[PDB]
Curated annotation (Swiss-Prot), chain A:
UniProt PTM: Highly phosphorylated on serine and threonine residues but not on tyrosines.
Its biological purpose: Phosphatase that plays a role in immunity, learning, synaptic plasticity or cell homeostasis. Regulates neuronal cell homeostasis by protecting neurons against apoptosis. Negatively regulates TLR4-induced interferon beta production by dephosphorylating adapter TICAM2 and inhibiting subsequent TRAM-TRIF interaction. Also dephosphorylates the immunoreceptor tyrosine-based activation motifs/ITAMs of the TCR zeta subunit and thereby negatively regulates TCR-mediated signaling pathway. May act at junctions between the membrane and the cytoskeleton.
Ranges where the PDZ domain occurs: 6-78
Segment of the intact protein contained: 512 to 604 of 926
Gene that produces this protein: PTPN4
Cell compartments where the protein resides: Cell membrane; Cytoplasm, Cytoskeleton; Cytoplasm
Name of protein: Tyrosine-protein phosphatase non-receptor type 4
Subunit structure, interactors included: Interacts with MAPK12 (via C-terminus); this interaction abolishes PTPN4 catalytic autoinhibition and thus activates the phosphatase activity. (Microbial infection) Interacts with attenuated rabies virus protein G; this interaction is required for virally-induced apoptosis.
Lineage top rank: taxon: Eukaryota
Organism the protein comes from: Homo sapiens
Family: Belongs to the protein-tyrosine phosphatase family. Non-receptor class subfamily.
């Protein structure tokens, strides 16, 4: 489904990736990357996570019908990362 | 318009 980019990133010392999320099922909007802070894992990873990117999969899980809070919990769920890297399948826009 | 820093 469309052009998809597979992104892998390890969190910092505070367990942060340096990116912001907007949208979700409850918000009636898609899960979009609203901000990417400079010099953070989301900014330094290759391929890069960009602003406006639509999150499709989080560690292989389909988040289409999930709420904003559920999406946040999935991102923070360190045990679901293989192997210690957060996997994100995104659609650039 | 909920926004969360992760």
């Amino acid at each position: 489904h469309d052009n998809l980019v597979l992104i892998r990133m390890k969190p910092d010392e505070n367990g942060r990736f340096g990116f912001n999320v907007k949208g979700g099922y409850d918000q009636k909007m898609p899960v979009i990357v609203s901000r990417v802070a400079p010099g953070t894992p989301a900014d330094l990873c290759v391929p890069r996570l960009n602003e406006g990117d639509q999150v499709v999969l989080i560690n292989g899980r389909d988040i289409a019908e999930h709420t904003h809070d559920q999406v946040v919990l999935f991102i923070k769920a360190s045990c679901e990362r293989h192997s210690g890297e957060l996997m994100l399948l995104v659609r650039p826009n | 318009g909920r926004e969360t820093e992760v």
